[PDB]
Symmetry: D2
C-alpha cells in the first residue's frame, strides 16, 4: 500500500528521518517498560555483590540468578511483572522463598533511582550521538557553501551580507555548547545510588563500589538521602533537552522563512516536505513544523519536574514527575529530521545573491567607507546613507544601481555639502561579495575566516566522537563483566557444588 500522503507535489517517499516524526508517539514505551530491563540488570549486580560479600552463598546466588532469567522471559509478554513487588513474587513462585533474599540491603527506592539513571544514561548517549550527527551535517554543509553569498537577518529584516557557510557555523557553535551541557550532565547522571536502601543505608555489609562498577557507573551518589531524594539530574536532563531544542526550533523557523513563497531563497528537499489534501500548489514544511512542535512540547516535562521538586521535602517521594521515554523519543526524531533537512537543503544561490545585491544590506559598508575615506564620524555618515536609502526606495533604485549622483544629493540634502568620494569607492562598497571579503576577522563571513572555524569544528567533532566512544565502551565492558560473573556463578553451582 502506497504512502497516501505522497500525492501531488509531495513526490517520492518521505525521508526516513521525516517519517520518524510520525512514528515516535505510537511506538514510545512507558517509563515502566523502558526501565524494566535496567532493573533486571540491577538485580543481577546486587546479587553478585551480595555473593562477593558472603551475604548469599554461591548456591543461593545461582538459584536466584537462574530464576531472574526465567522471570525476565515471562515479563517480555506479561507487563504486570515489570514493577518490583510483582516481579519478586513471580521469582518466589519460580524458585521458592530464596527469591526474597535478593532484596537484602535494598529498597524499591534505591532500585528505582538507579534504574531511572541507567535508562537516562543510555538515552543521554543516544542523544549525544544524534546531536553529533546533527553537528556533522551542519559543518559538512557549511564546507560546501563558503562562497554562497546571502543576507543575514536581524529582527526579521535584511541586515548585512554573509554566506550560508557562515550562518551554519553559528549553529555549529551553538551545538558545541549544547554538547558540553550534555556531557556535564552525564557526569551527574552516571553516579550510582545503590546502597542507600530506603534512604538511610543498611546494617548489611554491602560493597557499594562493586555494585556501581558492575553497572557501569563512574562513582557513587554518596549520601543515602541524596541517593533516594536526589532528582536534580532529571530536571537538568529536561532542561538541556529544552534549550537544545529551542535552538533547533530557531533553525527550523529560519529555514521555514527562507523557503516561503516570498523569500524563495531555499527549498526543502521533496523528501522533507508534504502537501495539502485540498490545495494542490502546497509544498508544506511539515518536517520543520513538527520539529518545532517537539521543541515546544519539551517545555512541559521541564516545568512538571521542577514543579514537583518545589512541592515536596528533601525526601524520597512518589510525587516527583519523571522524564519519560516519549519525550526523549520526540527529541531524537526532531534532531534526525533536522539533520536530514540541513544535509539535503537546496539553496537558491542566484536569488540569495540578488537580494544581497539589491535590497540595501550593503549600506553599512557604504557608511564605513565614508568614515574611512573622509573621516566624518559614524553618526553623520549613517544619516547621509539613511537618506540614500530613503531616496533610492522612493525612486525605485536597487542598491546595486546606487551611484555617485544619488550619494552626493543625499550628502547635500542632509548636510548642505557634497562629499569627497569616487564612483569606484561607492561601487566597491555596494558589491555584496566585497562586503563578505572585507569581514575577515574571527567569526566573520569571509571564506578564510569561516574555513578556520570549520577546521576547528572538525577537530572538535573528532573529540566529540571520541568522548562518546569511550563512554559507550565503558558501559559495554561493564555489562559483559556482569554477564560473565552471572554465568560463572550459575555454572559453578550446576557442575561443582
Amino acid at each position: 500500500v502506497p504512502d497516501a500522503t505522497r500525492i501531488g507535489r509531495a513526490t517520492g517517499a518521505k525521508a526516513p528521518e521525516f517519517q520518524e516524526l510520525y512514528d515516535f508517539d505510537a511506538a514510545a514505551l512507558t517509563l515502566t517498560s523502558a526501565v524494566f530491563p535496567y532493573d533486571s540488570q540491577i538485580h543481577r549486580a546486587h546479587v553478585v555483590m551480595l555473593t562477593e560479600q558472603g551475604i548469599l552463598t554461591v548456591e543461593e546466588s545461582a538459584t536466584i540468578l537462574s530464576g531472574l532469567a526465567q522471570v525476565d522471559e515471562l515479563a517480555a509478554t506479561d507487563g504486570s511483572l515489570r514493577t518490583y513487588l510483582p516481579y519478586e513474587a513471580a521469582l518466589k513462585r519460580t524458585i521458592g522463598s530464596v527469591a526474597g533474599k535478593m532484596h537484602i540491603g535494598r529498597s524499591r527506592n534505591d532500585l528505582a533511582n538507579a534504574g531511572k539513571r541507567m535508562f537516562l544514561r543510555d538515552q543521554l548517549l543516544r542523544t549525544i550521538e544524534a546531536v553529533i550527527g546533527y553537528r556533522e551535517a551542519v559543518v559538512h554543509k557549511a564546507a560546501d557553501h563558503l562562497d554562497t553569498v546571502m543576507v543575514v537577518y536581524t529582527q526579521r529584516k535584511e541586515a548585512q551580507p554573509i554566506t550560508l557557510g557562515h550562518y551554519l557555523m553559528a549553529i555549529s557553535e551553538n551545538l558545541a555548547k549544547n554538547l558540553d551541557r550534555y556531557r556535564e550532565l552525564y557526569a551527574r547522571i552516571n553516579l550510582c545510588p545503590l546502597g542507600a536502601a530506603a534512604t538511610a543505608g543498611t546494617g548489611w555489609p554491602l560493597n557499594r563500589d562493586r555494585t556501581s562498577a558492575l553497572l557501569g557507573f563512574d562513582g557513587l551518589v554518596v549520601n543515602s538521602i541524596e541517593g533516594v531524594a536526589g532528582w536534580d539530574h532529571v530536571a537538568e536532563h529536561a532542561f538541556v533537552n529544552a534549550v537544545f531544542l529551542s535552538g533547533l526550533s530557531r533553525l527550523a523557523s529560519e529555514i521555514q522563512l527562507w523557503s516561503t513563497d516570498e523569500y524563495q531563497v531555499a527549498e526543502l528537499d521533496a523528501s522533507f516536505a508534504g502537501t495539502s489534501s485540498i490545495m494542490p500548489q502546497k509544498k508544506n514544511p511539515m518536517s520543520l513544523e513538527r520539529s518545532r512542535k517537539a521543541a515546544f512540547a519539551a517545555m512541559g516535562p521541564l516545568v512538571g519536574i521542577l514543579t514537583s521538586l518545589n512541592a515536596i521535602e528533601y525526601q524520597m517521594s512518589a510525587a516527583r514527575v519523571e522524564l519519560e521515554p516519549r519525550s526523549i523519543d520526540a527529541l531524537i526524531a526532531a534532531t534526525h529530521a533536522m539533520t536530514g533537512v540541513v544535509r539535503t537543503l537546496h539553496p537558491n544561490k542566484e536569488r540569495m545573491r540578488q537580494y544581497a545585491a539589491e535590497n540595501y544590506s550593503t549600506m553599512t559598508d557604504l557608511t564605513d567607507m565614508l568614515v574611512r575615506r573622509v573621516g566624518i564620524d559614524y553618526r553623520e555618515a549613517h544619516e547621509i546613507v539613511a537618506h540614500v536609502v530613503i531616496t533610492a526606495i522612493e525612486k525605485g533604485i536597487k542598491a546595486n544601481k546606487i551611484g555617485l549622483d544619488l550619494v552626493q544629493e543625499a550628502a547635500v540634502a542632509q548636510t548642505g555639502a557634497g562629499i569627497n568620494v569616487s564612483a569606484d569607492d561607492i561601487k566597491d562598497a555596494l558589491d555584496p561579495w566585497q562586503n563578505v571579503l572585507r569581514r575577515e576577522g574571527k567569526g566573520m563571513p569571509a571564506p578564510m575566516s569561516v574555513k578556520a572555524s570549520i577546521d576547528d569544528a572538525m577537530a572538535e567533532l573528532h573529540k566529540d566522537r571520541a568522548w562518546l566512544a569511550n563512554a559507550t565502551q565503558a558501559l559495554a565492558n561493564a555489562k559483559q563483566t556482569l554477564a560473565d560473573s552471572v554465568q560463572q556463578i550459575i555454572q559453578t553451582d550446576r557442575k561443582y557444588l
Copy 2:
C-alpha cells in the same frame, strides 16, 4: 520607630537575612540600570582597543574617554541617558562630533549582549559566594550534630533512624552539584561577543582578543551570529537558579514540617520567625515561606526565556526575554535567609530521640535481625514484623516496649511457628542509636561515616572558595588594567600632545 511586626512571640529584631526577604523587591534595579555601568566599561574598552589598532588617534581617544566620565556622571541622576543612542547623543553634546567615532566597528547588538553577560557574570559570582556560604552553614551545623539521633522521612512518614548531621550532609552534596552547575555555566557566560557588531562582524580591523581581555572575559563567542543571537546562557542561568532554589524550597519545607506544633522536633530562632496580627499564639515560619515563594517565582523567568527562544529564528531579536535583577536578588535573599535559618536552628534533641525510639522506625533493623539470625528470607521476615507493628499499635505498645512475647505471637499468628531469637536480640534491634551505629557504610548515618563526608566537604569547600577567589581576582585585575589604560591616554594627551 520600632519594627511594628516584632510583637508578641516575634521577639527581638528580624535577623538581617530575614529582613532581606522584605527589602529586595522595592530595592531592585531595572535591567537597564543594572547593565548601564557595564556598558560604560565596554565603551572604554572598545575605545582603547580602537586606539591600539590605530582607528582612533590618542587625541580622539582622550577626548572620548574624558567625555565618557562626564556623561556617566550625568547618567547617575538622569536615567534617560542609560540606553545607548541617548548616551551617545549626550556624549556628542558634551565633546562634539568625535563622540560618534566610539561606535566604529560596533552595534547596539554586540554591546547589549556583552553588557548583559558582564552583569550576569558578576551576579553569578555573587550567587556562587552566597551558595558557598549556605553550604558552609550546612556543613558546620552538621559537624555539631553527629550524635543528634532523629528519624528520616520518606513520603512524609517516619522511615528509619539517622542523625541531623547525616541529613544536613544530603543538602551539602546537593549544593556541591549545584556549585558545579554554576561554575560550568560561568565558563559559557564569560565569553566576549564584542566584534560581532550587528551580526556579521565588520571591515574595521578590530582586535577582538584585546577588547575581551580588557573586560575580563576568558575567551570569545567566535561566530558573529552566535555573538548576537546566542542566548542559551541566559536560559541556563535561569535554569540553575530554578533547580538550586527547588532544593532550597525542599529544605525549607522539611524544616517547616519539623517545626509544626505537632512534630515539634525543631524550632526556628526567634529572629527568623514572625507572628500574627490577630492570633497571639503564632510563631510563624515566615522566613521559610518567603524563601519557598522565591523558589516558585524562579520558574517564571525560566519559562519566559525559553518560550521567547522557541518563538524566533537564529537571529538577533528584541523579542527575547531577559533574566532580570529582581529575580537574582530574590534568590540571594532566600539563600541568605536559609543560611541563617540553618545556622540558628534549634533541634529538640529529646523529642527527636523519643520519636526515633517510639514510633516504629526501628522495624527494619528488627526484620534484618530475623534474616541474619534465623536465615529466613527478607519477604517472610517483613510480614512477621508488619504484624508486630499492627498488634503494637492496636495494643498501644510503643516500639521501644516491644519484647519477646509480642514478636513470638506475631511469628505464630503469621507463620504458625515461633522464631529462635532472644530478648537481647530484639532489644538491640529496637535501640535507635544502635540502628544508627549499624548503618556505617559510605553515606550512611553512623558518626564515623558522616564525619568522613564532613572531612571531604570541608576540603571541597576550600576548593570552592579558591575557584571564586581566582575568578573574582581575574575580573578585578582586568578592571584595573582598563582604568590604568584610560588614564594613560587622557593624561598623555593632556600633557604631551
Copy 3:
C-alpha cells in the same frame, strides 16, 4: 495471582479508584486513536450535509456511507488507517473513485480542528462528571462532621478551632468555581469549525449549520481563519485542568499532613494506602502522592500549548501542541482517587479535639474576650495574651489549663496592672467548642452556619447534575439523528434506487 503490593500493613485490595492511578499510563490512547472515531462521525455528517445540498446524489452518498462502515472496521485493527489521507485511500480501494467526493468543500484542517473539539467535548463532560462526584463526596462527608472539632492551620501552624465539616466546605466552594470554569469552557469548545475548509471557506454551497447540528455542536466558529487557526480553547482546557488539580494537590497535601505519624489526626483507609518493600511499619499515602504527581504534570501541557501559540502566526499550523488523552486520563484517575480518599477518610476525633483544646488555637477568643469585657484595644489585648502563651509554654501548661492566675500575671508583667475578668470568662474563652459556636456568621464553622452552606451546596449540586444531563442528552440525540440519517440514505438507495 495476588496483588503483590498488598503485604504487611497494606491490607486488603487497592480501592478501584487507587488502582486507576497505576493503570492510566499504559492504557492511554494516542491522540490519533482517540480522535479517529470522531473523524469517522464527521465524515458521515459532512456527507449527509452534501447530500442535503445536492452536491452528492443519494446514490453517491449511500456508496460512500456504506464504505465508511467498512473502512472503520478495517481501522479497528489497522492503526495506519486512522489518519485522513490513508483512510480516504482505503475508502477508494473499497468503493472506487467516488470516495474522493467525500472531501468536496473540506480540508484536513477543519476536519482536524472539529475532531479534536469533539474529543475534548466528550472528555470535558467526563471531567465535569468526575468533578461533580468529587464535590458530592466532599459535601456528603461534611454533613457527617458538623461536630468534629479540629484546628485549622495557616502557614502550617495551628490557627483557630473549626470543624472538619467547615474545612470540607471550603473545598466544595473551590469546586463550585472550577465547575463554572469548565462549563464556561464547554461553551467555547462546543462550536463547529467545519466549513472553514483549508482556512478560507469554499465556493461549494455548504450548509454549515446542518453539519454542526448533526455533530451536536451548539454554534459555529464563524470566521474561517478562526475555524482552523483557533486553539485558545485547547490552552484553556489545559489551564482549567491545571488550576483544578492544584486545588486537589492542596487537599491531598493537607490530608498527608493530617495523617503523618506526628499529627495523627486522620488515617487513610487501608484501601488507599500502600507499604514499603523494606520498612514493615509503613502505611504510605501513595494515593495522595500519585494524585499530586498528576497535578504537577498537568503544568506541562499548559506550558507546551501556550509556548506553541506564542511561536507562530494567526494561521493553521502543524507546530501547535495538543492536549493529549493521557493527560486527561491522569486527571480523572486523581479525581476518582481523591473522591474515594475523602469518602473513606478516618478522622481521629479525640486527637483532633485534644489539639484544639491544648495547643493554643483558642488564644484569639481569649484576646477578643479581653477587648469585649474590659474595652481595651485589640493590640494591647494581643500583647497580654502572647505573654500568656509564652509563659504557658515555658511552664508546660496546656491551653485548657490556663487560668485566672496566669492571665493576671501576664497582664501585670506586660502592663503593670491586672485585668477585670473572671475565671469563668477565661474558661469559656478557652473551650474549643465554644470557639466554634461563637463563629456563627456566613462561612464560619458553627454547625448552623456550615449546615446552611451544605444546604446551598446540595441545591447547587442538583443544578450541576442537571446541566451535565442536558449537555450529554443533546450529544446523544444528535448522534442518533445522524445514525438514522445514514441508514435512511443507505437503505433507500439499496431498495428504491
Copy 4:
C-alpha cells in the same frame, strides 16, 4: 532634547503607544505600593461597618477615620507605612490606642486577600477597556478593507485568496472570546472575603454584606477558609493574560512577516518602527518584537502562581506567588501598541493582489472547477492540478498566465486523457477576486460575508462597552457612598457629639 533613537529611517516621533513599551518597566509600582490605597479603603469600610454594628461608637469611629486620612498622607512619601502593622502603629502614634480597635474582627489575611482583589479588579477593568480598544481598531480597520484582496497562509505558505478585512475579522472573533474569558473571571475576582478574619471568621457580629457593598463587591467569598486560602482567581487572571497575549503575539508575528523585505505586502507606520545604530537601511519592527516579548514574559507569572499553589495545603500561606503590577502594565503597553499598529498599518494593495494572482493560491478553485464541470472526484482533480503547478513552476508560468494548453497537457500527462473544460472556465477559476467572491458563506472572505461579520461585531462591541460602563459605575457609586459615610461620621462627631 530630541529622542536620540529617531534617526535615519526612524522619522518623526515614536507613537505614544510605542513609547509605552519603553516606559512601563521603570514606572511600574511594587505590588505593595499598588495595593496600599485599596487597603486604606478597606480600613474605612471595615470601620464604618463596625460602627453600624455597634462595635465602635461614632466617636471612636470618627477618631479612627480622621487618623486614617493623616496616616495615608504620611504614607504618600514614607513607603515603610504601606504594610499593615507599620500602618497601624503609625495610626496609634497619631490618634492613640483606639487605633487598635480598627482590627477588631479582622486579620492581615482577609485584608490582604481583599486588597489584592480590589487591585486586580481595577486592573481587569483597565484590561477590558484596552482589549475593547484593540478590537475596535481591528474591526474599524477591517471595514475599510473588504476589497483588499490578499493571500491567507497556512504553515507559512500561500494558501488561498482572502481579503485583509476577512483576516482582521478572525482577530475580532478571537478577541470576543477573550473578552468573555475576562468578564467570566471578573465575576470571580469581584467577591469579598472580608469577615474570614484569620481563616475561621470571628465571634464579633460583623455584617459581611455591608463591608462588601461599601467596597463595590458583587457577592461574598462565603467560606472563611476559601476567603483566605483561595487564590485560583489569581492563577486565572495570569492565564487569561497569557492566552490573550499569545493571540497578540501571533498577530504581531503575522504583520512582521507581511512587512519583511521579501514579502513587502504591508509596511508599519514610521511611528511604530525604529532603526539601527549601525545599519542605515533598517526600518525595524520594534513595536512588534517588544509586544511579543510581553506575551512570552506573561508565561512566567502563570507558571510561578500555579507552582506555588501546587506546593502548599488548602491554607492561607505566605508562599503563594502574586500577579504583579509590572506584568499587567506590560500587557497594557503591548495591547495599546498593537492597537496603534493595526490602526496605522499600510497595506501594499498592489503587491497583495500580485501575489494572489501569480503565486498559485488560486489552484483550489481550478480543482473545484474540474470536479464541478466534469464530475471527476476531488482526489483525481487535485492530482491534475498539482501537475499544472509543477509544470508551471518549471516553465516560469505565473498562475494568472496558466491557460487551456497547460491544463490539457497536465490532464494528459497524469491521466492519458484530456478534460472537457473551456479557456473561460480556467480564466475565471484563476481570477483571485472571483476566488474571493465565490467564498460567500458564513465566515468566508466575500465582501458581503465579511460585512455581515462586521455588523455583528459592531453590535457586540456596543455590548462590550455597556458591560464595562456598568461595572465601572458600580465601583464609582460604592466609592462615593463610602466617602459620604466617612464624612458623615467625622462631621457628626465634630459638631454634635
